[model samples]
Target: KLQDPIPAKIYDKNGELVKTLDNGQRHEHVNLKDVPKSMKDAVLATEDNRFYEHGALDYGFGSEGASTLTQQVVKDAFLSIGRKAQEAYLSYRLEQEYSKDDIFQVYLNKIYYSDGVTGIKAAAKYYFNKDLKDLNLAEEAYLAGLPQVPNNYNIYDHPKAAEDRKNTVLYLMHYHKRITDKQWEDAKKIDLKANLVNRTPEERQNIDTNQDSEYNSYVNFVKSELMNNKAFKDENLGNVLQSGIKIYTNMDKDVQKTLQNDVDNGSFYKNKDQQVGATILDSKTGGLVAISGGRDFKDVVNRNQATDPHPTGSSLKPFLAYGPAIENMKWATNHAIQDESSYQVDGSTFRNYDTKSHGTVSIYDALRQSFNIPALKAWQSVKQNAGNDAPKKFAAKLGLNYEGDIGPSEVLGGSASEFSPTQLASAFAAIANGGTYNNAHSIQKVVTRDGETIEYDHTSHKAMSDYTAYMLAEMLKGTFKPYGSAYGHGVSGVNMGAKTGTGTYGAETYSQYNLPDNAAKDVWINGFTPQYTMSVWMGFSKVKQYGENSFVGHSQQEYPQFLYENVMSKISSRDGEDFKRPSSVSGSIPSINVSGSQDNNTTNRSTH
Candidate 1:
């Protein structure tokens, strides 16, 4: 049974509904007068060549004998030279469809010229880096030909075929009197330039828009919830789309925009085509403010620009080591420990980042220093208490999947599995939010022309107890202070928490761990203030191993941390707000005890 429709409302932080969607009412309408003539022409030519003359669904050409020149060319080419059978395929497709407009609408909405491309608008931006209104006649003809057979005539993949199909469209336009013969000739002579080298920036923008759409926004916000709803299959989805139900999301626009700006202008932009994805969430509500899947949305098909995984490196160690230490072991900020050269587990050796020993150290020193040996020892302690499933179990608690073949190498930050930056950010957010994991979501709500409401929850089941989160948050504060390993000196605030990660490169198996060269390395620094949490990753796209001179010209303090500091400072300055530490959390100086000896403890402090 259908429920009563509820009026759609969107609210800001002050609880004021900012927008409304009403039934049978046209709000925020875009007039045809404002749209460019080229866009209108393309729409008419593709959807209905005789839109001005025909009633709905009635074109002069009957279904029986209508054939396009491209169709004939496909038949002739396949019969004569064993080439493209696109004409035959499209002919069959047109036969089954109700009208040309139906075909055009489908092509406009669903066809894919490339893996991530799905419509004329997206295709135009991906190929020519131009909007539909800005495309020339030749470009229009090229795009018009694509609907009939996208892959067969994809300019990126089959230039010759694409050119032929394009010419055929120009001829059709001439024969149909849509364009003059001179215009047709002019379009035919223009070379179809296919540039498919890098498509990330365009592609990322597309997904962001897609995720913003009201109909699919729920899918972006609460995927697991929708799957669990039991009413979101294919049939229900059509009903939802047509019904125009409103879905309320938990996204924050300002935070999302800030994150987007950081991604577009930050160091991640350097590796333009390299796979990069990130997510930002509000610590208090666990609502996703923004998410970027990759460098570009258009490049998604070449590789999953957004969700594809990569080695997380030292990023995972804090969760494996500190989270549990605070939760189950009752380890304190002053607990003594060692940051030595190597720690062996089941015949496997885990070495620190520089392969040098830090002698005796404290738990505070282990994290502030990002010392691999001490962290590995902490993991061993957890494994001994909970068995080999310890790491996987702990990861699962934080909503990270850890199924299938497990290994000791995971303790040293080696794993077959990879995570998008968003996933990592969410995990860290759970710690920052006092141990409750919140699923990240981008859409705040969706509303149709008619008013109705569907709401989404961004909260996650508790991943960690509050005590553990508080303890880890306290320990992480050391990283933001001066002399701490991953501190950002340029940013001033109450205090910040951060960690740096660098994965191993090259052909070395987990058993034969080789240190990554600074050049071939993927570097990351995930940080948080009281109000906002941010993560940044940097590295080359494809180069797996760095040259011997990789670290020769760089230092840990110079790369990821430098980028983080610059971005954070800019953001803080623009926002004009200082970080405020929660009352439950303390700002006491971190104590570093060495081997149960209070004599070795030391403290260093700096502003922000």
Candidate 2:
């Protein structure tokens, strides 16, 4: 079957075509004589044990046995003749017309090898980064087993299963006397990377468009942003946007590509269903430089996690309570706030992340430690000083939409609001930009085939004073220091600041979802460097008790810390300038330190 299809196309800011939604098919021919005999034999033994003996009717079309090699060849070759009986009869005639070597060679090139690959040439390049001729026995058996169980034996997604399947192929090869016993044993021992070669194209030093799906996911995100964009919203820009005239995205594909590579291929996302979403925005320009919604998915049904908005948890502290407190109430890094072991306001109760309160810590320690009580107390004073919904107003000014009411329940990051990484990136970037809020837009420029160029522009305004922004940024740097919530300071080498949050659904929402309210299911780290504002959200799509504050009942937070540190390192500019501290706050404040350890964190959670 052959046909030419035109898929929708989208380009990057530099006028390079990055994606095409084309439905096209073509097979790269493979010479049977050129393929290694072990590969051909392995397939014959596993799929059709008696391929040489039976013409085309080897499997007898029996319900119990799998389709013979000839039958499978017939099924793939003749698109219209799909009836099994017809396929079987046609296979026998074809066997008489062609040699077994011919069928096997063509079959080798046509069988499905999972991950959307259909030819051995494509398969070789897709998985092992090898060629059909260069494939070692181990790689060959692995590929042979892929078409057998595309999902269960995917080398990239399911290596252990793939390893086992590879062994199974070797066993079949051994049973059929295709290889020496030692050869089978050696092949089985070859281990997997060493199998899927987990590098996402973004993470790869070399750019490989065919494999860089992080870009695909990011491109998908841009499309979503463009759809709701004002310039294109009222106009019939859909056909123009996807028709490949030209559209410039804010993403630095190279940077985004590296981030995706590390994230997609990282050891942390081993759990197939574990969800992850992150966003990185250039602080000064508010351009989405890099992002990941989730792992790549063919159906847009379960899209990128970065594109979907999750709850903020304590991430709201810097925005809702602390940042607002600094801006409105003139609170500074040295401000003393009580980290009451137990805290309550109105009717709602809150507790620190460690569930313990280190009573009375400074704004610096409280934020670095991500304590819950201080933020609540801060919010109370902020409202008294700036009025109710003052924090909400501040959040909106930075791009986050705080639709929740002002109350005890909403105080201290128990805010029942959801926002995408872009929203978080936008808000955080403004602080990094010295309080200038720039509407984060993904599509930065657009050009038509007819030579009309349009710049996708956004208006910026001051969300807060340079003093407030710089003061907050300066304070946030301690978050990644050795004793901070994220103890990966030296690892990333970026003078960045951040707050970690563990959000809970609580009561009705938690119960309705059959999850416990006490332990949080959503955890996040959203912050910024001098150059970029980023947010990383990790958890299961549904309620998963991987940890509230730890995993396997231990106090070690391996996933979030590891995820944030590695991500920041890749995107962190080597010579990136540090977040500039103001010459002096337009106002005055003192410097102080509130020392404490989480080991004494008294309680699972409380409120002031």
Candidate 3:
């Protein structure tokens, strides 16, 4: 029972090949129908000339050996001497059951060709950077001669040896009368070094022909999802690279390409040292359509910043504080709240970033301006009206289930509250999806080698009432208008709602980094349209006093907004629609009156 390892094939949403999992060793099986006549004749002339007429083993035992193609196929798997007898017996059985074409096909695909490369299909692309169907007579002969001693004849290591071997194969074809004199003369005179695609060792190790190199992060995301699937693991398919599985993903190549190109051109960044993470989701289905992990991403498995957590700043207001208050406390958009310059809570004092008071402000304006005091009041309303866990439960439904204690500072994204760009985008997508929360994922389905199929079904549940979601969306709509936090920013030609947030260091830490009072540590812009939800985060992996570590300046803080606007405008222009009112929600904005109170105590400011 000798079986070869088969590499899995990954396809994009459009059913185009994305990647072929090389499984440590590169192998791509090809049918005999696609094999060119020149390549087949070259292989037979170089390896075993009487392959069709021979039984199992070639007893002639010339300078090469008595191993025919059939015996070599068996021997490649067994690697033995009594194993020699074993391979002979196995090859005899294999030849009796299979046709000559079938045996030759296996031999061609199973033999080692170059360093860590197997199969003629893979070898042709490695050495010539062309497919088997594109190879000419000289290229075919050059590839066919490598199996005898792949490492010894690799063009990069030994150019003279490789050229001699290729010439030897061409002479054999001419001596055997399989190729014409004119064909032999023309092929032998061709310059081998000029035609060879001699790639460096690093370049050869990263072969991604099925998909462009720019989409490597997307490829890795698909692989991560499929390998973690329960059904995929239950099949006991062994290593995914050797399972011959086909994975179909919900990736939008156009958006991915646009994101990569813009980032590479430095459109959304200040310098190469700054790091950025962004993710876009289909608001209608919660499918992850595109991701940009960081600028200049080149590794096969680099740090996926989109999936890693960071402090969200005021961006957390919509989910943990305001939205929950509307859903649980039934607070209307026009409800009144006091935005004190400083407020006391649990023996700790906090204040708004502007360090000024706007007394008796409407909930809509307070949220649009992102006042910290009123946001904490909203969180308190959720706790006082519904339960102590009301805000946490509501936020959990929206996918913000971070660990650690929830305190008054949680409203401003403090006290162990953090989220990734992906989770933040998905949470906002629930609002655009009419209150339903479906997890953002990469995979659509998986097809196994045995032809069994597993389709991905997104399980969803309501995170908030339709009325509450619509009311919140309407209030957030004002942030794109004049005097709002995110004013002068959003995708053009489409109606959108967005929030801007900034995380800052303390007063003492500011001087240490020579930063201004308003200098931000992390800048964020999260928004959604009727068709898509996107989140963008800009920060540094390691903070410094100067250069890359200096505080994020005003121009740099706007990078998140720039990234969101450019990407969404293109995506929305293709397929975008306005948000329709659900039947459960009222036709117009609800009008109501509510009041708030504050403790008159001057405690020192302990948190922001």
Candidate 4:
């Protein structure tokens, strides 16, 4: 009975599925047994009691007996090709050629259950918020009778009618002795309210080309990030990627000096054993004014983790993932996502640091909690509005390169693109500076020994709307307060926002066991006060887990937050400055997503 298949859909801005096909036909196959057995019996009783014996046409008294299940499937799936009588003949041929199980399977695949849904699998999810195997007898009977008067019995729009139709299906089942009399009465009392979630628009798209980048070290780091850009193709700058250039930086000698003291020499990291990387920025101008390349930057050049990249951990939630979401193509901060499997991409699942279920939460709350599912959820919203590669474009706008995997699961750093601490800090500075991005640089002024000026760009670009940026800054405020994960770890009352990350070492483990496994060594914290944005990174080998096992699998177990707190407090106290709130977020808040249990097994509810 089935004809041409409906293609998979694209997303709308809200990131739900759309574009099933140009014609909007829907059909998907599932094993017939996947549906509840009572559901099939109910359908047979309501549509045609003689289904087992009849070929196709019944010509019996009741309208339900006129056409068998086989005829109905033929009409719904391939109606354009055949008339009623001829369709019945084809239906008879199908019955004779195939076993009853095979005929029923085809029927289950082709029957339209209700508006915008066409199969048992879709109906199970749409009406009951359940998998086929999880549906109750009541839910199965409800779907069984839905096709008879789909609109009048539509679950969302006409609850009472839908319940009445469901009761009728149960009654038919009882009359046919397919279900017990008690089963019929019990089912009749079931509520019509389906388990469906609040639905938004759905959309998706296929791009043959890498679209994320179709869009600075503190100098070398920024250059490395932008190495392959098309802009460098001009003859004079052709060697930009390969050559060394003098750099003029916005670095404040004062702030940079302070970060080194707290973050360097293994100050908070302790023992001078673990590696560290940190960054500080002039909040208003998007200037990266201070940085910790690593605990051993002066000891080794490449070891400056500020230039080195690793899995970004939770830092990107506020950076490339959801902050970009609030940049507003009519984005809403209050738009909520129900954290669940629906957001997972094929073959992957997202998990929060805690490995616990967080019910439906607003984007703001999602970030506050640092849950994984919501980040992917918000990414979907951004993608549907823009393209499938929203994070890549967002990264490029903030002066970072994204030559790595950028899939829906990327919310949890599944991508190959590992970002430097300076890059992460610069992106946050952009947020603090109302969405203007200034390329990061380390030298205030650089010239050859001969005093020749080398070309450099201190240019600032508008990356996101000021309103969106202010909203993001407002949302992040909770992160550094008692209500947030980084609260006790950072300098409170400084009016700054912060986020923490505990990164994995390499490819996921066989068990995944979801990191801060024995293999996890990357730790990070990034935050902004009125005058400065600061980011910190520290890596520990199991050879270096020298403490009381204080900071373990949990991100809060680490101390980058302490480093950022001590440094920013010093900077603000010396400079006598405080963060200035923008009018947009001063009056109201902006907006802000995960997964399975990370099984943090910590008393502190520190999430990342």
Instruction: Give the per-residue lDDT of model 2 (tens digit) for 461-569.
Output: 8898776787777667777665777765334556778877666655665445544334455667777887878888876755444232222211222365566777777
What's the best-to-worst order under lDDT? 3, 2, 4, 1
Q: TM-scores, in order shown?
A: 0.59, 0.62, 0.80, 0.52
lDDT of 4 by residue, 1-608 (tens): 33323332222223333222223233455777776777778788888787777643444222333246767777675434436666656666666667777767767766777656777877786666677778776788788888876777876677678777877777788888998878777777766564655553341122122111100113334334333334343444333422333334454545555666555443455444566777776777665566566553432234556766766777788766676665544345555566764445567655665566666666667786577777877777677776767667777888767566576544665466478776787888887776788866543333333456544446578877666676677778877655576867656446677777766544444134343344455677778766777777777534333232224544434567777767766777454354444444423453220112121211222323
Task: Give candidate 2's TM-score.
Answer: 0.62
RMSD of 3: 6.2
For model 2, what is the error of residue 316's alpha carbon versus the real structure, in angstroms, after optimal superposition?
1.0
Tens digit per residue, CA lDDT, model 1, 1-608: 11222334444433444334332221122223444565446545653466434432433223323334223322433335423444545454544444544433333443445545655666766678765667777788777777666667876567788788777767667766777778777777776674333555454334332332221222333333343342454455324443434455555545445545555566624334343445555665556545554443322133432344666777877777766765565555666665667767777666776788866666776786577887877777777776767667678877667657556565545665466666777788877776777665544554455554334445467887665666667677777666566654536544467776776654563224333433445566777655556665655455422342222234632465654565556554345343333343333436422222233333342212
After superposition, the stretches of candidate 4 with alpha carbons farther than 4 Å from their true spots are 1-249, 265-267, 270-272, 299-302, 341-343, 447-455, 505-519, 541-551, 573-587, 590-608
- Range of the 10 consecutive residues with the lowest summed lDDT in candidate 4: 208-217
For model 3, how does the per-residue alpha-carbon lDDT over 438-491 read when each residue is reduced to its tens digit? Answer: 877998888888989987776578888886677777777778877677777765
Q: Order of candidates by TM-score, top first?
A: 3, 2, 1, 4
RMSD of each: 11.6, 14.9, 6.2, 28.3
User: Relative to the unseen true structure, what is the C-alpha lDDT of residue 111 in candidate 3, on a scale of 0 to 100?
Assistant: 90
Q: What local distance difference test score does each model get?
A: 0.55, 0.67, 0.75, 0.61
lDDT of 3: 0.75
